[PDB]
Amino acid sequence: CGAEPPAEEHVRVLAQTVKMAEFAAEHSVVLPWSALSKVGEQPAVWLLDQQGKARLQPVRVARYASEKVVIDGGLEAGQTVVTVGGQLLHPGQVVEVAQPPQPTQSTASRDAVGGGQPGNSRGGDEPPPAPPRPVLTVTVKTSVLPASVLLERDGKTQVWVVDGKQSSVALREVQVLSRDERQVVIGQGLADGDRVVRAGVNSLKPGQKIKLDEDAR
Amino acid sequence: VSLFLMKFVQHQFFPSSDRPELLVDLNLPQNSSIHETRAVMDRLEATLKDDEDIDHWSAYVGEGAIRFYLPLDQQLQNNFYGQLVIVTKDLEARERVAARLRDRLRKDYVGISTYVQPLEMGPPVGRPIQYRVSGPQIDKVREYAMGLAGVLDGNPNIGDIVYDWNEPGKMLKIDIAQDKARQLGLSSEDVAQIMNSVVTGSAVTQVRDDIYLVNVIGRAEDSERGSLETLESLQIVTPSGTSIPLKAFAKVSYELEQPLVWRRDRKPTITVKASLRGEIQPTDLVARLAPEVKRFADGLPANYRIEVGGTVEESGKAEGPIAKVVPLMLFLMATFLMIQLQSVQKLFLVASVAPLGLIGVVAALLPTGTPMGFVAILGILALIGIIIR
Amino acid sequence: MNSVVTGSAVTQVRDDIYLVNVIGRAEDSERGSLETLESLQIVTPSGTS
Amino acid sequence: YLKDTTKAGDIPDIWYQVRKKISDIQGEFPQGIQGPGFNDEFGDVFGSVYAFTADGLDFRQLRDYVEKVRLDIRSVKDLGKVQMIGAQNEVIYLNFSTRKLAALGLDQRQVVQSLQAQNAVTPSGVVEAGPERISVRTSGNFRSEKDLQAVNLRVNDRFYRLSDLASISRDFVDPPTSLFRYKGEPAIGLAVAM
Amino acid sequence: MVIQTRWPGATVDDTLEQVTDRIEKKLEELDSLDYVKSYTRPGESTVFVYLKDTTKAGDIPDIWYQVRKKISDIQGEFPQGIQGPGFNDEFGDVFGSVYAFTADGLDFRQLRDYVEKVRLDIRSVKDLGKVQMIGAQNEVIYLNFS
Amino acid sequence: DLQAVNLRVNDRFYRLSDLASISRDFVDPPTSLFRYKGEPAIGLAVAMKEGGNILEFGEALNARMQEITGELPVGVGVHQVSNQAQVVKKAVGGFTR
Ligand SMILES: *C[C@H](COC(=O)CCCCCCCCCCCCCCCCCC)OC(=O)CCCCCCCCCCCCCCC
Ligand SMILES: *C(=O)CCCCCCCCCCCCCCC
């Protein structure tokens, strides 16, 4: 009939000690833009006691805040003021250890995490067999070509597809360093059937046949 | 003893939906550029992109579409709301995917409100537990909401509580004396013109490039707009060709102003929603916490008021006419019985069996710990009918 | 003729939840009663009267 | 007035028909104002009315108190319509010293255009210059008599103060059109409907 | 019922106190209404209307029409800001399967055009309710002056 | 179409480029973004006409979708979400069971 509720968990947070700085304002105090809360009729912040609890401290900000709020007045040299708030309990709040530089693995998750296998994306996996898409039919007897057309990935997918009667593959691995992210211009290794698909490049399998009937209205 | 033990029997108005679909919502601490929302979105996406039961998953930055009339939808809270829909193979809790996601967000960045959600069957009810606090003054209702959540967090069976629009925004106040303007050769007209050319330039005619229409907008040079830091000590140009630093300005400073409010019934208010823990039902928790919070509410000026925001309101509203309708039908069926019989003695005799049937309905319910279901609140009447039969 | 009966209309103001529309008008030392409106030395935009 | 031979209930349909018949034809009238007052007369039932007499105070603050009363009244259990009476809408006359105006070579119409261009500009706007949401706000738009008394002009336009050119008449109540009075004394009533 | 209303920028407090407050007060007189949920933003006003869950169905459109009427006349008093009732009713009730058209290295314009062509070809299906796209893009043209 | 607009003689008739910067059209700061499998896309929600017999509308719809795919141009990835026809199928199946 009666159970046992789980233990209490301190609300996770990432605070930072107080370090007087001369950041352009003598003994000024800087902090990220997400560490300010209005109390009563004035801005303020939250200071954490050494005995795992939170309290509110009214401040008086005067210096501008360009993504970094800079205040002057009402400070405790070497005090862990919060820099992540907006949902804490005003009267009192049992805080979670914020001592680690990034108590969250987000500091390295942007580059790599290490849990399981990676996701999918067009250009690395084999698409399923589908009816032949009406080719881009952008071929013209030839030069420059919009960077969107070519979808060279690590040099292993040069747009080798020929724009001819079969939409086959060819030995066109010319790579010019004039890569201005706007258009690719080449002097050698070009032909009439050198052009390729615009968007359906990586999402297409080599040698796949196409259809001449195109959608238009 | 049956009627006695009836007290601790828990009640719930609606169960969830076994649909293999699941959703998750996120809310940022303060309003920022939608770019930040997309940043958190893509990070969470990169986290979950290869695992079993993970397929047919989409994002929603600023608004969540509607599948069925089951849930509601936060219309436009881009800077404070996001959505992620995921489809499981057989069960969202098969491998406790929801729990894994909870641990993921836990290890994720702090100060990011997040909540998991399995689709619910029945009329929308929003968060399972909420509370509304009123006040004709901003700071008053704010501090009172804080003083309320303080006492509310007494019981540890609640995961976390979240206030509403309880954060200000960095506002920039500026003004001119207009004396130096005419002194330097500047009029209020050109003043407003410049001020417009700095924030949002004038509007011009639209264009018809296709079936759609594109409205072109004018604006001054951007080498003087884009960031506040560069907007310091600006040598603003004058229509007379001259250029003078912003020194002629005054009171240019930072202030705080919450850009979100809720004038429920033409009155400001705050909505505090709280998650749960363990396995109790919101109704029972509300009943338990009712006295203390009531006293707290009493300890406040009369012009203010507190109300619940959970599901008890909806349950009561639904069962409203029930009480005012069922007794009439009771007497109807009673007379119906009296038609076949001819003595009140036999009437009361067979009637005695009617209430006594509440034995099994609870005996087969207490050990299982199953909450009192609304459907049962209905079927019990059918039970009365059949037993009387 | 307009400046004599009802002056031109201008933008309104937002002093509170309500709105107050301001109205222009010529000098009142030439309007108000018909008796004084007899033999009026009306001024001209060219300064003459 | 429709014929007293039709059934009830469908009356709103007839009202809608009227609104339809006039909506389209509206595109032919001149620049004069137009708006259907009451498709139906909501003024059917009215409980007790309450007059709030007072003297030596602001009619503005009086109406404000009445509005506060309306807000507090909303707390009552059941409420129909709530309508005030004899409201006051102060206006602001701007008499011009036509002689001096012509002497300066300019006309008040230009002043009107300038004031229009000055008022039509919102004194605030969202900027979001940084990651967090940011907005600017200035104090330059007209909000009171003094807010417009110190408006300048161009150099070639002899930038002067409005007082130096025209008479900024203080806001005042216009010639009445509907007056309420209790026991021979001015007041403001409030009718409430169940 | 959802009622949206924009404004070309203004102080949120003034925005609400002027447009939101007037809309709410005027609409309050409406009968059979229970909840009036206000919603404000830097330059947006949103009204949520919730009637009492005690009325019969069928006549709901009549109530919606009443709302439209109550706001139509009062419209002649708001300032030059935009205004338009979003949904007198929520048509977004049922929705079959949705279809995402992923693509990269192309024109979002041509993408939407292809989607529209898809809509035209879809119209040929036997029965069709509503067809609504999402995340559309509306390109603008800035003109910065020296 | 507007870059080569002139002015009057006393107004120094010049090209807009010679006076201002004609910024190329571009998408404004987003307000509503859709994304499939962490990738930007554009969805299309369709509703069944009221009174329409379900379990068939979806059949004809997917068939037409197959034809559209037959006509799908290059660089287009069709992805179906919320195929309720299958949901209803499994539901009624277990129900009758
Ligand atoms: C839901 C409720 C709780 O379950 C329990 O069993 C609670 C008891 C704790 C576990 C101890 C079990 C007792 C062992 C029994 C002896 C042997 C039995 C073995 C079974 C034989 C089968 C072969 C294996 O379960 C209930 O339904 C009972 C709850 C009723 C009591 C509720 C308490 C509320 C207040 C009571 C007031 C007491 C008044 C007297 C003053 C103290
Ligand atoms: C309150 O909720 C009680 C918690 C304890 C639950 C223990 C499980 C009870 C299940 C009873 C089934 C008995 C089967 C006997 C078989 C011989």
Specify whether the CB–CB gap between A57 and A45 falls below 8 A: yes
Residues 6+ away with beta carbon under 8 Å from D25: none
* A contacts of D132 (beta carbons < 8 Å): 33-34, 67
Cα torsion for B99, B102, B103, B106, to the nearest 10°? -160
E145 with B214: Cβ contact below 8 A: no
Q: Helices marked H in A70-190 — which ranges?
A: 106-109
CA distance A54 to A39: 15
Kindly identify which residue of chain C lies nearest to residue E78, measuring between CA atoms.
C19
Which three-class secondary structure state does DSSP give residue B110? coil
Residue B156, CB-side half-sphere exposure with 13 Å CA sphere: 9
| Shortest-distance Cα residue to atom 4 of ligand 2 | A1
Strands of B111-207, DSSP E: 113-118, 129-134, 161-162, 169-175, 203-207
Which three-class secondary structure state does DSSP give residue B66? coil
Which three-class secondary structure state does DSSP give residue A190? coil
Which three-class secondary structure state does DSSP give residue A159? coil
Element (H, E) at A15: strand A15-16
Specify whether the CB–CB gap between E79 and E18 falls below 8 A: yes
- CA E14 to chain D, closest CA, distance in angstroms equals 11
Burial class for D31, CB neighbours closer than 10 Å (0-12, 13-18, 19+): exposed
Burial class for C30, CB neighbours closer than 10 Å (0-12, 13-18, 19+): middle
Chain E contact for D12 (CB, 8 A cutoff)? yes
B126: left (phi over 0), alpha (psi -120 to 50) or beta: left
Which three-class secondary structure state does DSSP give residue E77? helix
What are the φ and ψ backbone dihedral angles of E112, each rounded to 5 degrees?
A: -65, -35
* Ligand with an atom nearest the CA of residue B371: 2
> Whose CA is closest to B51, among B105, B82, B92, B108?
B92
Q: What's CA B300's distance to the chain center, in Å? A: 25
Q: Which residues pair with E84 in a beta bridge?
A: E4
Residues 6+ away with beta carbon under 8 Å from E39: B75, B262, E45, E46, E47, E48
> Whose CA is closest to D114, among D144, D159, D146, D166?
D159
Element (H, E) at C13: strand C9-13
CA distance B246 to D138: 14
> Whose CA is closest to E141, among B316, A199, B154, B217?
B217
CA distance A46 to A83: 8
Distances, alpha carbon B339 to alpha carbons A58, B328, B333, B344, in Å = 79, 17, 10, 11
Residue D190, CB-side half-sphere exposure with 13 Å CA sphere: 17
Specify whether the CB–CB gap between B16 and B118 falls below 8 A: yes
Give a three-class secondary structure readout of F52-69.
CCCCCHHHHHHHHHHHHH
Q: Which residues line ligand 1 (CB under 6 A)?
A: A 1; B 366-367
E117 with A151: Cβ contact below 8 A: no
Specify whether the CB–CB gap between B47 and B18 falls below 8 A: no
Give residue D10's identity as a one-letter amino acid code: D
Which three-class secondary structure state does DSSP give residue A17? coil
- CB neighbours (10 Å) of residue B260? 19
Give a three-class secondary structure readout of D125-136.
EECCCCCECCEE
Q: Which of B46, B61, B67 has the CB atom closest to F82's CB atom?
A: B67
Residues 6+ away with beta carbon under 8 Å from B338: B344, B347
How many residues are given for chain D? 194
Specify whether the CB–CB gap between C7 and D63 falls below 8 A: no
Distances, alpha carbon B206 to alpha carbons B218, F25, F30, in Å = 12, 12, 20
Burial class for A199, CB neighbours closer than 10 Å (0-12, 13-18, 19+): buried
CA distance B255 to A42: 9
Give a three-class secondary structure readout of chain D.
CCCCCCCCCCHHHHHHHHHHHHHHHHHHCCCCCCCCCCCCCCCCCCCCEEECCCCCCCHHHHHHHHHHHHHHHCCCCCCCCEEECCCCCEEEEEEECHHHHHHCCCCHHHHHHHHHHHHCCCCEEECCCCCECCEEEEECCCCCCHHHHCCCCCCCCCCCCHHHHEEECCCEECCCCCCCEECCEECCEEEECC
Element (H, E) at E111: helix E108-122
Q: How was this structure determined?
A: cryo-EM
Which three-class secondary structure state does DSSP give residue B290? helix
Q: Helices marked H in B273-373 — which ranges?
A: 282-298, 312-323, 326-340, 344-356, 358-363
Q: Which residues pair with E2 in a beta bridge?
A: E48, E87
Specify whether the CB–CB gap between B61 and F33 falls below 8 A: yes
- CB neighbours (10 Å) of residue B257? 17
Give residue B267's identity as a one-letter amino acid code: K
> Whose CA is closest to B63, among F28, F34, A26?
F34
Residues 6+ away with beta carbon under 8 Å from B13: B122, B283, B311, B314, B315, B318, B374
Distances, alpha carbon B36 to alpha carbons A13, B62, B81, B84, B108, in Å = 19, 12, 12, 16, 15
Burial class for B51, CB neighbours closer than 10 Å (0-12, 13-18, 19+): middle
Kindly identify which residue of chain E lies nearest to residue D133, measuring between CA atoms.
E42
Burial D5-17 (b: 16+ CB within 10 A, else e): eeeeeeeeeebee
Q: Which pairing describes strands D90-96 and D172-173: parallel, antiparallel, or unpaired?
A: antiparallel
Strands of E1-146, DSSP E: 2-6, 33-40, 44-51, 84-87, 98-102, 131-133, 139-145
- The token pair that represents B84 in the structure block: 């992620």
Q: How much distance in Å is there from the Cα of B358 to the middle of ligand 2?
A: 21
Q: Which residues pair with A44 in a beta bridge?
A: A37, A58
Q: How much distance in Å is there from the Cα of C44 to the middle of ligand 1?
A: 106
CA distance B264 to B132: 10
Specify whether the CB–CB gap between E27 and E49 falls below 8 A: yes
Burial class for D108, CB neighbours closer than 10 Å (0-12, 13-18, 19+): buried
CA distance B130 to B271: 7
- The token pair that represents A34 in the structure block: 């997400």
- The token pair that represents D34 in the structure block: 């137009």
Q: Which pairing describes strands B55-61 and B82-87: parallel, antiparallel, or unpaired?
A: antiparallel
- The token pair that represents E49 in the structure block: 């209307």
- The token pair that represents A158 in the structure block: 């040069």
Give residue B62's identity as a one-letter amino acid code: G
Distances, alpha carbon F88 to alpha carbons B66, D180, F83, in Å = 18, 67, 9
CA distance A81 to A61: 15
Q: Which pairing describes strands B372-373 and B11-12: parallel, antiparallel, or unpaired?
A: parallel
> Whose CA is closest to B12, among B128, B147, B162?
B128
Going F46 to F52 to F58 to F60, the CA torsion angle's sign is negative
**D–B contact: 3+ Cβ pairs < 8 A:** yes
Distances, alpha carbon F45 to alpha carbons B29, D39, E119, in Å = 31, 39, 11
Specify whether the CB–CB gap between A192 and A202 falls below 8 A: no
**Percent of chain C as helix, strand, coil, to the nearest 5:** 20, 25, 55
Return the best residue to mutate from B4, B366, B368 for the ligand 1 pocket (most ligand atoms within 8 A of CB): B366
How many residues are given for chain A? 217
- Give E18-22 contacts, CB < 8 A, sequence gap 24+: E18/C14, E18/C17, E18/E79, E19/E45, E19/E78, E19/E81, E19/E83, E20/B263, E20/E45, E20/E47, E21/B263, E21/B266, E21/C17, E22/C17, E22/E74, E22/E77, E22/E78
Specify whether the CB–CB gap between D187 and B210 falls below 8 A: no
Residue E54, CB-side half-sphere exposure with 13 Å CA sphere: 12
CA distance B382 to B380: 5
Specify whether the CB–CB gap between D133 and B259 falls below 8 A: yes
Q: What is the CA radius of gyration of chain E?
A: 20
Which three-class secondary structure state does DSSP give residue B209? coil
- The token pair that represents B239 in the structure block: 């229509």
- Give D13-18 contacts, CB < 8 A, sequence gap 24+: D15/D39, D15/D40, D16/E65
Q: What's CA B314's distance to the chain center, in Å? A: 15
Q: What's CA B152's distance to the chain center, in Å? A: 18
**B–C contact: 3+ Cβ pairs < 8 A:** no
> Whose CA is closest to E71, among E14, E16, E34, E30?
E30
* C contacts of E17 (beta carbons < 8 Å): 17
B265: left (phi over 0), alpha (psi -120 to 50) or beta: left
- CA E35 to chain C, closest CA, distance in angstroms equals 23
D106: left (phi over 0), alpha (psi -120 to 50) or beta: beta
- Tokens 């199946």 correspond to F93
Residues 6+ away with beta carbon under 8 Å from B240: B185, B186, D155
Specify whether the CB–CB gap between A184 and A147 falls below 8 A: yes
Q: What is the CA radius of gyration of chain C?
A: 15
